């Protein structure tokens, strides 16, 4: 949707009509969006070792004090900062992990993204066109006392979970919640942002998976995403539609 959609999105973040959203914020947000791509270019050619040592993660102990307990862990994060760089870090401070990526078309484009994220040292599973359901694999990883990483703030389909996000209705994936209730693994919200010419990363307290309510779980995970985004409102570079009302009557029919 571009800058116009980004504008309409930041509007919900700072409680403002889109036209009145501060321009310095918009400038910062687009600069972050541009930075992600500029970094994706060089990232495979950088020294992942130096980045493993130099960069850090606030309250990472949450993750360590769960894998050492043999549970496995769900690392659920929004599209903020550079999530690909945070992946590199984990590879260098744990090892290869498993995530999923929406299968793009053309396949030539998808094959370019896999070749990129494989050059960073982790495993991506497509949501379609697999020898198995990705959910099946991820569950077996969590059972093998391992961590997974999942983009968890946007899933605009019939499978999506109707949650409130900055006081408006959107839909987020249930994957993080189901895999957590099932394997009993720890569900950790995670946030990434840009910190000067560097990178910021933080792991947050695990959520209550007891109730079994996927809805209230995903909701609490959105309330955490929201608070973190409002803390770094220029790092959440979402240029695609997020909220339902920003969709056409056509694209909204697609989700029932
Ligand atoms: C602080 C803990 C570290 C966690 C590291 C998170 C790694 C996330 C990488 C997953 C990539 C998923 C790509 C799908 C998103 C897209 O391209 O639209
Ligand atoms: Na202006």
């Amino acid at each position: 949707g571009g800058p116009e959609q980004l504008r309409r999105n930041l509007a919900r973040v700072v409680g403002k009509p889109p036209a009145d959203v501060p321009d310095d914020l918009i400038r910062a947000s687009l600069a972050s969006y541009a930075r992600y791509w500029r970094e994706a270019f060089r990232l495979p050619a950088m020294d992942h070792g130096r980045l493993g040592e130099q960069l850090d993660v606030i309250d990472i102990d949450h993750l360590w004090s769960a894998l050492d307990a043999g549970r496995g862990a769900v690392l659920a994060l929004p599209h903020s900062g550079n999530w690909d760089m945070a992946g590199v870090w984990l590879v260098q401070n744990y090892g290869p992990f498993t995530t999923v990526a929406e299968r793009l078309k053309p396949e030539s484009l998808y094959r370019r993204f896999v070749e990129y994220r494989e050059s960073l040292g982790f495993e991506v599973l497509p949501l379609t066109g697999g020898e198995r359901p990705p959910f099946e694999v991820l569950a077996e990883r969590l059972t093998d006392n391992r961590p997974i990483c999942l983009m968890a703030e946007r899933d605009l389909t019939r499978s999506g979970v109707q949650v409130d996000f900055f006081g408006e209705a959107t839909r987020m994936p249930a994957g993080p919640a189901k895999l957590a209730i099932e394997t009993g693994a720890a569900l950790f919200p995670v946030h990434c942002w840009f910190e000067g010419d560097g990178w910021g990363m933080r792991v947050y307290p695990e959520l209550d998976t007891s109730s079994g309510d996927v809805t209230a779980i995903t909701q609490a995970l959105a309330d955490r995403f929201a608070a973190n985004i409002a803390t770094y409102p220029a790092d959440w570079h979402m240029l695609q539609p997020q909220w339902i009302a920003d969709l056409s009557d056509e694209r909204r029919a697609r989700l029932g």
Side-chain angles (χ1 to χ4, degrees), residues 1-101 103-110 112-130 132-135 137-144 146-157 159-256:
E4 237 68 85
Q5 184 63 70
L6 170 61
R7 190 177 192 181
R8 288 198 64 91
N9 288 333
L10 296 176
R12 278 97 171 186
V13 179
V14 303
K16 221 77 141 161
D20 295 346
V21 178
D23 289 277
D24 58 336
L25 172 61
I26 298 168
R27 284 193 290 277
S29 182
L30 294 163
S32 293
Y33 171 82
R35 184 183 167 168
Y36 169 87
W37 288 112
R38 187 177 223 263
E39 279 175 357
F41 187 75
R42 67 161 75 196
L43 186 57
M46 308 178 77
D47 191 315
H48 302 186
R50 172 168 151 280
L51 297 166
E53 291 169 9
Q54 285 181 339
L55 320 195
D56 306 274
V57 186
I58 288 147
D59 296 338
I60 183 67
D61 285 333
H62 284 104
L63 178 57
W64 299 155
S65 68
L67 296 172
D68 300 342
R71 307 175 54 180
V74 177
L75 300 175
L77 66 156
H79 290 81
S80 181
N82 192 331
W83 49 84
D84 289 335
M85 174 61 78
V88 172
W89 186 88
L90 190 61
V91 170
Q92 301 281 306
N93 293 276
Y94 176 95
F97 64 99
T98 302
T99 181
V100 310
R103 192 151 182 168
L104 301 167
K105 267 128 179 60
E107 182 75 356
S108 68
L109 183 73
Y110 161 90
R112 187 52 152 79
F113 260 81
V114 176
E115 283 169 13
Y116 156 79
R117 290 197 177 103
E118 281 182 6
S119 79
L120 303 178
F122 38 96
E123 188 191 351
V124 171
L125 301 187
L127 285 42
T128 65
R132 290 202 281 168
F135 185 107
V137 180
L138 300 176
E140 294 171 1
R141 296 279 196 282
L142 295 181
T143 281
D144 193 32
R146 299 264 227 169
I148 63 178
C149 298
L150 291 173
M151 301 302 155
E153 98 284 34
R154 193 179 176 260
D155 180 41
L156 303 176
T157 71
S159 296
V161 186
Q162 301 143 213
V163 291
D164 280 314
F165 192 45
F166 290 101
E168 273 189 60
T170 185
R171 285 185 184 184
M172 301 191 181
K178 283 183 167 190
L179 299 165
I181 293 169
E182 192 172 312
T183 71
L187 180 59
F188 293 119
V190 176
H191 209 71
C192 318
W193 64 89
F194 294 113
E195 186 73 72
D197 300 320
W199 302 266
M201 282 167 289
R202 185 174 188 184
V203 183
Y204 290 78
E206 101 186 71
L207 263 55
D208 193 348
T209 46
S210 305
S211 70
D213 204 336
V214 164
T215 299
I217 274 167
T218 302
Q219 177 59 73
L221 180 58
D223 291 348
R224 171 59 73 207
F225 288 153
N228 298 1
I229 282 160
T231 294
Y232 305 95
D235 290 272
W236 186 53
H237 43 88
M238 177 64 74
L239 279 56
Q240 320 295 326
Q242 173 70 66
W243 283 272
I244 287 159
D246 287 10
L247 300 169
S248 65
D249 297 17
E250 287 79 61
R251 191 150 160 192
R252 211 177 108 194
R254 181 183 314 174
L255 48 71

